[PDB]
Amino acid sequence: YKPKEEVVKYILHGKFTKNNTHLTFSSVVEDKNFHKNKGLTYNDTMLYYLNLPQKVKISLSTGCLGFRKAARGEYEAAFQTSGRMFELIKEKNMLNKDIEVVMDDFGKGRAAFISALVGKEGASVVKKVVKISDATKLKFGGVRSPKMRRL
Amino acid sequence: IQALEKSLDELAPLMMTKTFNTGVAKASVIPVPLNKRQRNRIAWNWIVQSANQRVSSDFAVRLGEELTAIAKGTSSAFEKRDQIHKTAIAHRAYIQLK
Amino acid sequence: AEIARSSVENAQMRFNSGKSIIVNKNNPAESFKRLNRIMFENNIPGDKRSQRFYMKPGKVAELKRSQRHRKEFMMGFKRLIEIVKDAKRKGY
Amino acid sequence: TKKIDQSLSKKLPKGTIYDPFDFSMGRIHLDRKYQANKNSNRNDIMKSGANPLEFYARPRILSRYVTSTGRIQHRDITGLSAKNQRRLSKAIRRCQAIGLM
Amino acid sequence: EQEVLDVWEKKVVEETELMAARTSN
Amino acid sequence: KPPVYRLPPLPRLKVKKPIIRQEANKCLVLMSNLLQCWSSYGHMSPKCAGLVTELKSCTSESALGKRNNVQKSNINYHAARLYDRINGKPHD
Ligand SMILES: [Mg+2]
Ligand SMILES: [Mg+2]
Fold first, then answer.
1. 3-state DSSP call for residue F80?
2. Residue D63 lies in domain
3. How far apart are CA A6 and CA A33, in angstroms?
4. CB contact under 8 A, B93 and E25
5. What's the CA dihedral at A73, A79, A85, A87 to 10 degrees?
6. Which residues pair with A60 in a beta bridge?
7. Is Mitochondrion included in the keywords of this UniProt record (chain D)?
8. From the CA of A75, how far away is ligand 1's center (Å)?
């Protein structure tokens, strides 16, 4: 009957492409009065709690730390960008609830992000991380990729 | 002589980190063990450097005084040993063990 | 109602994808190693790379034939090495 | 230390006969090398004579032959005959299309 | 059995010490 | 039933890079433990006394100990010796 938005967990998403690394930190917000609404079916309630809304808090790329052009897709750019994220999560008091890490692709920043989180740079965030997962998007047939490059 | 050997055995570092130019990338700082002859060289050079800060014109006198102070506990080269062992403890994981 | 509140735990994990690991709070680097093993046993990195550029069907068929031959050839090679080692052990 | 890793010690079953070699490291290594899932046949429905296509509405049984992501296992891994592999794969694909797997 | 169990004792100890060092990593 | 894979006739039977077991150096492991002992109980702590004593003896004469650091594989010698006997080739 009253909006009671509360954070349930945080999602640390990393997209590691060939030319850049994108790191997004989000909050899984749950209106704790959703079940108190009128005209709400058991299906709508279960469907609302199975995909809870998400709000973006921190969005970073390797170009936000001053890495330009070809340097954006390198290992060092990702390692420093991962550090800046782990710091901004502590400077925003967003290290109280559990964090779920979602990694997307297999560029050079995937192993830098993992090293920065299992090392000194991520000794505070790693303590809250409860689940790691991969979200690489593959196609079963799908659209035709571009032709092979003749180099 | 027993005092000299005891001082050399306490001042010399057991291990020392060395940079190996392995690979086109940055060299690796890996702790390496030292033999007794290599340990004595490191400790002796520290003693000589400390001795040459004393006032006597005669090297034998400066060396004698330096060795007496080390046999009595006081020496500025124990700091050097602690700093070489700190670095090695930091790079303990860099060791290969095969 | 609460019926839709107390039955969300299983429901949440009932629609799993199989690409998730529960982190070991003690050794968090061992959980990332487990996730990497899943990726390699489902050929996720290989499939992603193979989907970047289009390959003609004839070329795809050629590569599939050669890869199978090399896989089978290696199995035949290991069988012969095992015979060698067994024969050596018995003094042949 | 009064403890040894299980991988470095062999536990001789009860009622079995042994040789002095059974206490050596060679036995440990030999048991690892020749460790195959040969007991699967007796626990493998698809290696019993049933038609795998009769299990297309039983995702629990079919889920034993796919990886964590749902990828059908190669015959090299399942150890099935060509016919059963062919029938099992059809069952899984049909199960996926019905909305059960 | 003693001859075999003596060699096995040495190897176990050796391999329970390499593991300790390798795992320390 | 387990599929046997039979190779075609081959010009040779050889392992490109035969695997060898390189036993770990006893002095290096002693150093790796002492370094760890100092990491927990502290540098020069009385708890690591035995480690220090053992390390000194291991490295007294040679920093890597007196070891037979030489091991080679013979698989290729035997494989070439036995291949013609065990390949199952038909008679001429
Ligand atoms: Mg690039
Ligand atoms: Mg185009």
1. helix
2. 44-100
3. 10
4. yes
5. -150
6. A23
7. yes
8. 10
